[PDB]
Amino acid sequence: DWEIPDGQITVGQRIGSGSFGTVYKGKWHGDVAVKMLNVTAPTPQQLQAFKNEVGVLRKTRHVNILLFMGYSTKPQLAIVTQWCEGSSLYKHLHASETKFEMKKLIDIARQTARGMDYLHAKSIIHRDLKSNNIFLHEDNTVKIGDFGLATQFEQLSGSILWMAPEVIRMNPYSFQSDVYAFGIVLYELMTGQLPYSNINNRDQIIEMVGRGSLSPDLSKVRSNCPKRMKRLMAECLKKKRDERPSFPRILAEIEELARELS
Amino acid sequence: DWEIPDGQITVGQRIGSGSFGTVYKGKWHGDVAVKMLNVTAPTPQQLQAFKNEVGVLRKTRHVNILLFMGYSTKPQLAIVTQWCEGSSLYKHLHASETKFEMKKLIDIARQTARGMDYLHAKSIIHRDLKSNNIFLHEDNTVKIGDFGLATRWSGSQLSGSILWMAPEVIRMNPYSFQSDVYAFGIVLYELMTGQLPYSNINNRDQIIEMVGRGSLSPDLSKVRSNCPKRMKRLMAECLKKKRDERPSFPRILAEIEELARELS
Amino acid sequence: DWEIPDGQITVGQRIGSGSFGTVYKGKWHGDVAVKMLNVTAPTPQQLQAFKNEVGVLRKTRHVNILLFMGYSTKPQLAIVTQWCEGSSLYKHLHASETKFEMKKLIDIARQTARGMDYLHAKSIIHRDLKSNNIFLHEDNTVKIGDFGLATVKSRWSQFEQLSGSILWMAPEVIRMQDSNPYSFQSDVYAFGIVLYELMTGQLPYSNINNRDQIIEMVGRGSLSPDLSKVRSNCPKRMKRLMAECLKKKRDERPSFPRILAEIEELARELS
Amino acid sequence: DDWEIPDGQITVGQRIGSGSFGTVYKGKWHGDVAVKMLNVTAPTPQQLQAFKNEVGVLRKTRHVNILLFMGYSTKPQLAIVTQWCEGSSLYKHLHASETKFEMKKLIDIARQTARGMDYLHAKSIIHRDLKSNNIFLHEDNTVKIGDFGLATVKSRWSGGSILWMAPEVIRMQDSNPYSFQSDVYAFGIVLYELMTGQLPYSNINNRDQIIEMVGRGSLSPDLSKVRSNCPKRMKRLMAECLKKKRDERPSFPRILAEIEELARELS
Ligand SMILES: Cc1cc(F)c(NC(=O)NCCC(C)(C)C)cc1Nc1ccc2ncn(C)c(=O)c2c1F
Ligand SMILES: Cc1cc(F)c(NC(=O)NCCC(C)(C)C)cc1Nc1ccc2ncn(C)c(=O)c2c1F
Ligand SMILES: Cc1cc(F)c(NC(=O)NCCC(C)(C)C)cc1Nc1ccc2ncn(C)c(=O)c2c1F
Ligand SMILES: Cc1cc(F)c(NC(=O)NCCC(C)(C)C)cc1Nc1ccc2ncn(C)c(=O)c2c1F
Ligand SMILES: [Cl-]
Ligand SMILES: [Cl-]
Known part of the structure; x- marks a missing residue:
């Protein structure tokens, strides 16, 4: 009890x-x-x-x-x-001058896939994976959770940058929409930025991601990003949700390419 | 201010x-x-x-x-x-031996159509219209509001109100003018049958699943014998499973106001 | 009162x-x-x-x-x-080491047929018959009831809220199209699945982990229980009756007056 | 540079x-x-x-x-x-005001707009929402191009730019719907506003019908509504900017030079 x-x-x-x-x-x-x-x-x-x-x-x-x-x-x-010590992955990537070596970025990707693989094996759908819900406890251990907090106008917008096309359209949430969101996290880790940074109008983003073929620009991944990681990210980001891999393959793939680096 | x-x-x-x-x-x-x-x-x-x-x-x-x-x-x-004096429509219909005359039942439907028509003209969706949210103030004036209201106002779970939810709302722009028309249609069903729909289906999950898949809808043979033909037609119109086949409240209001005149 | x-x-x-x-x-x-x-x-x-x-x-x-x-x-x-003493048929068959002799398995089928035959004669459609709603009172008397308690869906979780009933739903109920598909005939099909649990000792589609595959394929008719899994000493009359109760076209299933008479006769035959 | x-x-x-x-x-x-x-x-x-x-x-x-x-x-x-811009946007002047514009002024409004869009494109900037509401007539003599929209999210309890949106932007079926060419199209609708005084499809308002027909090319702006004293080279330029096929649209260096040259001819 x-x-x-x-x-x-x-x-x-x-x-x-x-x-x-x-x-x-x-x-x-x-x-x-x-x-x-x-x-x-x-x-x-x-x-x-x-x-x-x-x-x-x-x-x-x-x-x-x-x-x-x-x-x-x-x-x-x-x-x-x-109590988690430190900062979210979002603050590290996008709101601080923390510079991560590529080894550490892979390690963060690997730990996030471990947690997500575990949740899915329990048939838990997180529904809002993003770098803000990834806490870097003690600067060494990813903790997936729900860390969104408001410390005038009301926040009306969802996590549109991590929403798969079928989610940003609108049971949209599924294991496969969590995989897509994980793909955007890989994009954050491997490029250091958010997708669609040249498109200020959120309606245009919503329209183009949910209807058209707007997808993150993979030419922005750092030169030292392993080819296997770049390829895995593209698989997670497939528009058709049944072409995205599942997290057992995602984990196996990240653990194996990381061992190639050692 | x-x-x-x-x-x-x-x-x-x-x-x-x-x-x-x-x-x-x-x-x-x-x-x-x-x-x-x-x-x-x-x-x-x-x-x-x-x-x-x-x-x-x-x-x-x-x-x-x-x-x-x-x-x-x-x-x-x-x-x-x-402060509203009296009881909700739900209590009159389902929790008390209040019996209304058909004329009174039509008048309640007409006044609820006026409030809903006004709301839609102001581009306000109620999202939870039901006999619990219709107050019979002084037993002469319908007031539409939130009268259960522990739920709704976050700019941004199916724990209640399922009997008034349109097929497309249960499925999951789910809330619309047209889903308000559906809920109004169920209110008409309450007024014209004296009862809630799906009275023989205990399992709330089978109702939810069947209503969302278009395989279950109110039994309209239960409308009482003196319910006007035009009122039954209108009800079936408001309950159409395809939201775009449902009339808008200007039409709903006009038809009720006119069929009412044909009976005082 | x-x-x-x-x-x-x-x-x-x-x-x-x-x-x-x-x-x-x-x-x-x-x-x-x-x-x-x-x-x-x-x-x-x-x-x-x-x-x-x-x-x-x-x-x-x-x-x-x-x-x-x-x-x-x-x-x-x-x-x-x-107050019922003991466990449901589901706990006995699938979450316990209880081993029933075939005579006792027939008897549980007989008592369940009696109770469903009675319900249908009262114009009562059960709508959720399954081994979890068959209570083995005092380990000798079937009590049909409906022991489920509804739960609201969590955010972190198709037919999800009915997932505990899916193996017992007739194809037309799985399809769930146009009109209410719950009937005396869909109750019969759920009795057929109970017969399958009794006579095979297992739930149907044990080989199929994909729950969506089960739903699609059952509803279409390209999947039905593997009747080769019945135990060797399952009487021929019972395996034939099971298959009748499991017919895909609901109008081809027998009614419970004939179900109960078939089980009661075949039970007498084994002494 | 701070x-x-x-x-x-x-x-x-x-x-x-x-x-x-x-x-x-x-x-x-x-x-x-x-x-x-x-x-x-x-x-x-x-x-x-x-x-x-x-x-x-x-x-x-x-x-x-x-x-x-x-x-x-x-x-x-x-x-x-x-x-701080002084005055009103082009939209308010044409569509919600008693402003009468001399055709000389209208050409000069289109000429300055072309100058700024030509500048933007030369700097590799796609505007993405050019419309008359985003063209400010500062002190009634200087066009200021901006983007004065503020994003809004429809509330749960309540039940735009489309008139200037190029057909490919409506369809969302071709690569890169937003481009220099979609900005040229929007400029074409601004030219139509200028030379006719009204918004396009003014006598066809069926709404989601208008959107669908513009996307599939079965509805385009009625060019017969241009003012009589509208130069022919301006009306053919507007028709070129409005081309359904994006590759047939001219670029702003050519757009600006055509307007420039034609505005000299009428003083
Ligand atoms: C208290 C709390 C209780 C909860 F229940 C959830 N819920 C939740 O994670 N749900 C998703 C579950 C699953 C992933 C399985 C889907 C979150 C939190 N937050 C929390 C916890 C620790 C924290 N330590 C430090 N700091 C700075 C924080 O801000 C902080 C914080 F915000
Ligand atoms: C106090 C209160 C404050 C509110 F703000 C709202 N809100 C609300 O109606 N919103 C819907 C808005 C719109 C229809 C436009 C969509 C409701 C209420 N309730 C209320 C009011 C009067 C009452 N008089 C008598 N009795 C017995 C009651 O119980 C009672 C009651 F519960
Ligand atoms: C209390 C109760 C009241 C009810 F009304 C229903 N309803 C119901 O059976 N309806 C089906 C009717 C018909 C078959 C005709 C369709 C069920 C129950 N439950 C219940 C009863 C006895 C129990 N004894 C022991 N133990 C361990 C239990 O858990 C237990 C239990 F959970
Ligand atoms: C404050 C502000 C800051 C901005 F950053 C943008 N942004 C923007 O133009 N971006 C497009 C950039 C590019 C063209 C290069 C693509 C717009 C505005 N608005 C604004 C500015 C001045 C105003 N003067 C008078 N009046 C009555 C106004 O209303 C007014 C106004 F609303
Ligand atoms: Cl976002
Ligand atoms: Cl309800």
């Missing part, structure tokens, strides 16, 4: 708010993170969403998935996980 | 039994209803949801739309509307 | 849970089971399903149908039945 | 327009400016990229007929600062 009685967790610094609750740093046999609701009486809908999310996290035991640790129901619904 | 200064609204008894309810009877220049986010500090998303709803409500002025009256921010986020 | 006043039932151990309801073991003049809605203000479909379920159970009196005993209104809607 | 404006220097004034994520204000910074400010909580990776890419394109432009980029800010919020 993973319920944590009231009075044990010392809630500390507020990190941000998402669509569920508010994430804090806390103390419980060390450092933890607490995502908790604002209400003392949750609706049946909030309680269902809470049981769903505890339900999926309780099914995961893998070094590359954010470690679930427990939950509270009083005074508020709360999900307790390990 | 519609902001109400602190300490003007007196809050009273919460409406409902569940301790998660948000609606209270209150006093502000008379009776009011107050929908309150009871938290010590709202999140940004809660702040935005509160502003999204007030933003839609303040664009409505119509006798058949719940009257928005103001909002407050301290001590909590609170939306203030008129 | 079958309403049970409040405070008479001592609700005990939680036994199972879904998003809307909870099953408990209880005390009410002996042991009972209690299915109780989670909320005090249910949705319009939950309230409608409660009334229809009480109204259907109220009309059943048969040793192979779960015994309805009463229902509650306060604090929450609850339906009260007998 | 165009970053320290915080506290700009005085943000009247709000001019809003979209779902951003807002344009009139401001004060060594005189009058316009300030486009990202006002969204938790800006997405794509919104942050578009802010950066727009500053990088604008910083490569110095031309009297291109909206003048002046600076950008990072604190407290991301903002792009430009000159």
